[PDB]
């Protein structure tokens, strides 16, 4: 018998299966899971600045609807809209609603820059029983419902604001579509109204349309919400013969800013995570995740697979 | 594996090697013993760690994106927004599948390679003093006490000391 | 001479060229083609449920135009539109036509839920010589052409339907733009019409515009087709002072359903394939295909390459 | 190939090996013959089959998508729908090109590897009884009748039986 | 001492670092950079046909605004719009402006097919002090400003052109929105205008809206620009009761043609490059580039990395 | 590297090998010298050149695309156009990163492989006339003048001429 010396390697009792280019099931000593499958079940309020809309969606928030007052001057990285949000004010619709939501979400702020306006020849601060605040008739806090003056006419409206500042302004305004001709004349004298809002470079003109619409909060008429941007240097004119829902000022557009809105259900926790999904927060170093394709922040990329094991050891050959 | 050393001419691994990935098991006039090889274990661990840190360089940070769920049919724009997202998810799912498969192919070949480099290293230290037994073992054709075994393990073994003895045993 | 033993491998006379990371042309013993290049030249009617529009496109089908009656109650995975399809009825246009086609294609059904309506103060079932059925004046089978009553006025229309059901309804309706003022008054008394269709949450109002348009099937006027969705619980109102092309009921929206439309030329065969293209069906296990980027069903992914050979054997070295 | 056995120190392949991928061709006192090696052939076929089944896991099933051809210019939306699709097709064309290239690189190395593992296996069975000739052949330094040849091929050859004869021939 | 023979490989003093799957920094003998980082700082006029808008953007060019006359009959692979471009004519806006720019850019031509029209009952060739050419009142060279006739009325306009040719025509036309009722009647007699432009298959009708808009070049009114395509065989009708800004002919649509517009700052050089970016031209064989995601022609693909070194030699081990 | 020849059992490279990638350095009764091996150098250069030409097949040519910068907020469509482009850029950045990494992994293994094939080639030419020293060198156990050295380098060395001399020296 001569001495022998053998070279070998380690082997554990229980290996882990990985895939390779040629094999579905190959047992190795150790492996790491690359697909994150777990989330927190609460939204973490840090490091991202969250604002919870609770019962207002972002637009009701921007218009100043009754449930929304706590959202004034709010600023966010991510605004959270709740599936429990409800309309509380005069029924309205927004042509290209989605784009207004997108533009608001993106600017990241509900801090209103209030403005003095002189609306000549009309009653101001119109209120409605479809918009109750503390049990009393009220309206969108950011809008001004004008009607005809005590003595008669809707003195033609023609008011202008110059953008003196260094930021792009966003102006929110509306048109009232009444349910009858009685109501049209009762409110605006003129049989047929007109609202024209314009800058040096863009313009919108709306003739309101009468008729009965299903009753909401007892109301058959509607307000259509429009918006106009105004660059530094430009001006905006509000020209109306009737039916103008007037602005009380404007919002500041900070463009291309890391801000957004997340439609989620989960409560805001006290955890810390740089990654929010509609399903909860992800706390993970894994390159991939399957929790949700709605992922905001520093997140693993969404993939379909529920598992991808990376081998981190040699073939496991016990026995 | 490309080298046929792990799951190859090394029949199996040692469950008792708990302090290394690769090692020496010997038999001599004084008995038997197992020790870990540090260089070969370290070379494998470094390469695996290297490829793991590589998989972290984290460059996925997105805020305002597009909507991904919808409350109502719309037609044209919605079709596009969904097609865009579905196209994106398929391509990333494909990237991750291939990345893992090919990474695993490679790691297994690397680990098999490092086993083989250890075998080859010792083959070269022993010169004409030993013969390959076919199973990851060398028959050493001279007395080799514990100090001599350790000199093989730490790469100070000088084959010339044992050469005449070994070559003589090799030949009857 | 001592005995020898040699290790070797196989070699065939005619190899196949593959590509690798370093070589364009490498000859191996065997290889498989991964890009599918062939199709059937007929569309296979299984396993996917096909419906052939023949001479109606999907919208003429939905409106009930004369060539379209055989498409009633039809349901599909894939609706086939033919390049031979023709308009057979009063000339019309559809604002955002594509989205209506998309919405229809997707719901996968032409089964109309008919509804009793009471249109008060108007003549009903208007017909036209631009829409002939069996040689006789007719109209879109799903629409109701209202005009002024024998004795005079177009008694104001205001009709409402409540969505009592559990599915979203799609209502197809129109506005008639007349070629002259003679014709306007002749049909609707009123000098200027108005059609307003609305729910609790959305609304459209159209004032029709008069004027001469090129003659189609002898007709210079047009109908504009609009559509309104109505959720479970909501209501729709049809309010018109004139020019309403009224619905006869609604379609059911099954949303997010594996249904679509394919613009194709090929006849429907009797073959079996889970993959349809505009060029024919693909019957293949190949991962890739170049036949067409229009591919519906379980299909190889479209790629630009006409060939990708996967090696399935070793280097071929004869001689 | 990474191993230099196929298209390497094995000059060429055998067109007459019609029942295996790898084999033995011998010469002894009784004549000559070719037989297939089953283990090495099976190891290569399994790996190739493995990678082929892998390429089928079929996850491409799409219904309503977007329009991909257009009857009339429209501008903005159409540009996007085409850019989306063209972006998608380029990325998949790229995936398929790379997948095949790297798969083929690998297969060729695998097949070359398996050739080499066979060579190495036999090298180990023969010990000091044979010398590598440089061309995939071993010169065997003792008489080796058909039974002996077969014992090499089926891995029961015991080198100790022939050792004194072989070592003696090796040395004059 | 016996002779020895050693096998070895080369080694240079200064290696280059590459990355591999397992290592960030691995020194090899030689390497090639795969990401192009440099550009020319002038746009190369070959092999791609460039047209420099200088002070006209593409649309002012298409309308025939005063600075634009040198762009007549111009044709391009790439039209260059300059950030110094300015409006020089009556203030206008274009609903879906972007799509008109896209359609023009794509057709690759500003060669106008002029047409004789008979506008009956109106004054023609209206001019404006907001559109000066050589110090004199003028208008868009491709448009025809019609007003009421010396003696009175705006004889109703109804003119038709048949597409006799084999190419799709693009017609550019407008609607004048006046600043007051004085001006409305002064120009078009009628209190409220109407412009309806239509083919067999599509149609647009606009009622102009009055009101004050911020003054541009002293002018408070606006022209809205619209466009209508006309297939071989089809016809177009221009029907107006007032406020029509009439076409003088049409542009030819060559569709699906390698043509586009680049918003750039750089001067046109005399270099040669098949790849233009907004930042300059790329002259490179590198597969990748980081210069800009705006890349037109035969270009390296844009990537985020500033460097990717491909190894082209073995490990470098000196000493 | 997978083979452990470059940055492995070859301690380092030769800065003076200026006319090849791989070579022979010898020592004999007449002195010392270095020469380049053409086959092994050519095999490596060909493979690297192959993979470089492969990376040029140029298929990126785009004209009218979509807008990629914007003068004013718009919401929905703009979000999509940016998301589309950002998705595209991420996927290509990923492709390029992986392509280079895996290409470099491979090239380094190829170059290491070719070093090893050269070593193995010479090992086979020398048969029982030389012993592996462990450092990429063979000790040759007979006189080998310049012509003999060159016969090794050009693959005409016939081991049978020197066999009795060498085998005798090997054994005392
Ligand atoms: C890893 C491989 C290319 C085989 C693959 C398989 C699969 O089912 C999905 C994606 C893949 O990359
Ligand atoms: C396989 C390789 C990366 C070289 C490649 C070449 C090519 O012309 C197109 C796509 C590719 O992946
Ligand atoms: C090469 C690797 C897969 C590790 C990678 C790392 C990275 O940070 C980005 C992209 C990659 O492909």
Coordinates of N, CA and C in Angstrom, one line a residue, chain E residues 159-220:
Chain E
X159 N -67.9 75.2 -53.7 CA -66.9 74.8 -54.7 C -66.4 73.5 -54.5
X160 N -66.2 72.7 -55.6 CA -65.8 71.4 -55.5 C -64.6 71.1 -56.4
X161 N -63.7 70.2 -55.9 CA -62.6 69.8 -56.7 C -62.6 68.3 -56.7
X162 N -62.5 67.7 -57.9 CA -62.4 66.2 -57.9 C -60.9 65.8 -58.0
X163 N -60.5 64.8 -57.2 CA -59.2 64.2 -57.3 C -59.1 63.3 -58.6
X164 N -58.7 63.9 -59.7 CA -58.5 63.3 -61.0 C -57.2 62.6 -61.1
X165 N -56.3 62.8 -60.1 CA -54.9 62.3 -60.2 C -54.8 61.0 -59.5
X166 N -53.6 60.5 -59.4 CA -53.2 59.3 -58.9 C -52.5 59.4 -57.5
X167 N -52.5 60.6 -56.9 CA -51.9 60.7 -55.6 C -52.9 61.3 -54.6
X168 N -52.7 61.1 -53.3 CA -53.6 61.7 -52.3 C -53.2 63.2 -52.2
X169 N -54.2 64.0 -52.2 CA -54.0 65.5 -52.0 C -54.2 65.9 -50.6
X170 N -53.4 66.8 -50.1 CA -53.6 67.5 -48.8 C -54.0 68.9 -49.0
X171 N -55.2 69.3 -48.6 CA -55.7 70.7 -48.7 C -55.6 71.4 -47.4
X172 N -55.0 72.6 -47.4 CA -54.8 73.4 -46.2 C -55.8 74.6 -46.2
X173 N -56.6 74.8 -45.2 CA -57.6 75.8 -45.3 C -57.9 76.3 -43.8
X174 N -58.7 77.3 -43.7 CA -58.8 77.9 -42.4 C -60.2 78.5 -42.1
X175 N -60.4 79.0 -40.9 CA -61.6 79.6 -40.4 C -61.2 80.9 -39.7
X176 N -61.8 82.0 -40.0 CA -61.5 83.2 -39.3 C -62.5 83.5 -38.1
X177 N -61.9 83.5 -36.9 CA -62.6 83.9 -35.7 C -62.3 85.3 -35.4
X178 N -63.3 86.2 -35.6 CA -63.2 87.6 -35.5 C -63.3 88.2 -34.1
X179 N -62.8 89.3 -33.8 CA -62.8 89.9 -32.4 C -64.1 90.5 -32.0
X180 N -64.9 90.9 -32.9 CA -66.2 91.6 -32.5 C -67.3 91.3 -33.6
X181 N -68.5 91.6 -33.2 CA -69.7 91.5 -34.1 C -69.6 92.6 -35.2
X182 N -69.1 93.8 -34.9 CA -68.8 94.8 -35.9 C -68.0 94.2 -37.0
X183 N -66.9 93.6 -36.7 CA -65.9 93.0 -37.6 C -66.5 91.8 -38.4
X184 N -67.3 90.9 -37.6 CA -68.0 89.8 -38.3 C -68.8 90.3 -39.5
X185 N -69.8 91.2 -39.2 CA -70.7 91.7 -40.2 C -69.9 92.5 -41.3
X186 N -68.9 93.3 -40.8 CA -68.2 94.1 -41.7 C -67.5 93.3 -42.8
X187 N -67.1 92.1 -42.5 CA -66.3 91.2 -43.3 C -67.2 90.2 -44.1
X188 N -68.2 89.6 -43.4 CA -69.0 88.5 -43.9 C -70.5 88.7 -44.0
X189 N -71.0 89.9 -43.7 CA -72.4 90.3 -43.7 C -73.2 89.5 -42.6
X190 N -73.2 88.2 -42.8 CA -73.8 87.2 -41.9 C -73.4 87.4 -40.5
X191 N -74.3 87.3 -39.5 CA -74.0 87.5 -38.1 C -73.1 86.4 -37.5
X192 N -73.3 85.2 -38.1 CA -72.6 84.0 -37.7 C -72.2 83.1 -38.9
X193 N -70.9 82.9 -39.0 CA -70.5 82.2 -40.2 C -70.5 80.7 -40.1
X194 N -70.0 80.0 -41.1 CA -70.0 78.5 -41.1 C -69.0 78.1 -42.2
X195 N -68.1 77.1 -41.9 CA -67.3 76.5 -42.9 C -67.4 75.0 -42.8
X196 N -67.8 74.4 -43.9 CA -67.9 72.9 -44.0 C -67.1 72.4 -45.1
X197 N -66.1 71.5 -44.8 CA -65.2 71.0 -45.8 C -65.4 69.5 -45.8
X198 N -65.7 68.8 -46.9 CA -66.0 67.4 -46.8 C -65.6 66.6 -48.1
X199 N -65.4 65.3 -47.9 CA -65.3 64.4 -49.0 C -66.4 63.3 -48.9
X200 N -66.3 62.3 -49.8 CA -67.3 61.2 -49.7 C -67.2 60.5 -48.3
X201 N -66.1 60.5 -47.6 CA -65.9 59.7 -46.5 C -65.5 60.4 -45.2
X202 N -65.1 61.7 -45.3 CA -64.9 62.4 -44.1 C -65.4 63.9 -44.2
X203 N -65.4 64.6 -43.1 CA -66.1 65.9 -43.0 C -65.8 66.6 -41.8
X204 N -65.6 68.0 -41.9 CA -65.4 68.9 -40.7 C -66.3 70.1 -40.9
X205 N -67.0 70.5 -39.8 CA -67.8 71.7 -39.9 C -67.5 72.6 -38.7
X206 N -67.2 73.9 -38.9 CA -66.8 74.8 -37.9 C -67.6 76.0 -37.9
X207 N -68.2 76.3 -36.7 CA -68.9 77.6 -36.5 C -67.8 78.6 -35.9
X208 N -67.5 79.7 -36.5 CA -66.5 80.6 -35.9 C -67.0 81.2 -34.6
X209 N -66.1 81.5 -33.7 CA -66.4 82.1 -32.4 C -65.8 83.4 -32.2
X210 N -66.6 84.4 -31.8 CA -66.1 85.8 -31.7 C -65.6 86.1 -30.3
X211 N -64.9 87.2 -30.2 CA -64.3 87.5 -28.9 C -62.9 88.1 -29.0
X212 N -62.5 88.8 -27.9 CA -61.2 89.3 -27.9 C -60.1 88.3 -27.4
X213 N -59.0 88.2 -28.1 CA -57.9 87.3 -27.8 C -56.7 88.3 -27.6
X214 N -55.7 87.9 -26.8 CA -54.5 88.8 -26.8 C -54.1 89.2 -28.2
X215 N -53.7 90.5 -28.3 CA -53.2 91.1 -29.5 C -51.9 90.5 -29.9
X216 N -51.8 90.0 -31.2 CA -50.5 89.6 -31.8 C -50.4 90.4 -33.1
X217 N -49.2 91.0 -33.3 CA -49.0 91.9 -34.5 C -50.2 92.8 -34.6
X218 N -50.6 93.3 -33.5 CA -51.8 94.2 -33.4 C -53.2 93.5 -33.6
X219 N -53.3 92.2 -33.7 CA -54.5 91.5 -34.1 C -55.1 90.6 -33.0
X220 N -56.4 90.8 -32.8 CA -57.0 90.1 -31.6 C -57.8 88.9 -32.1

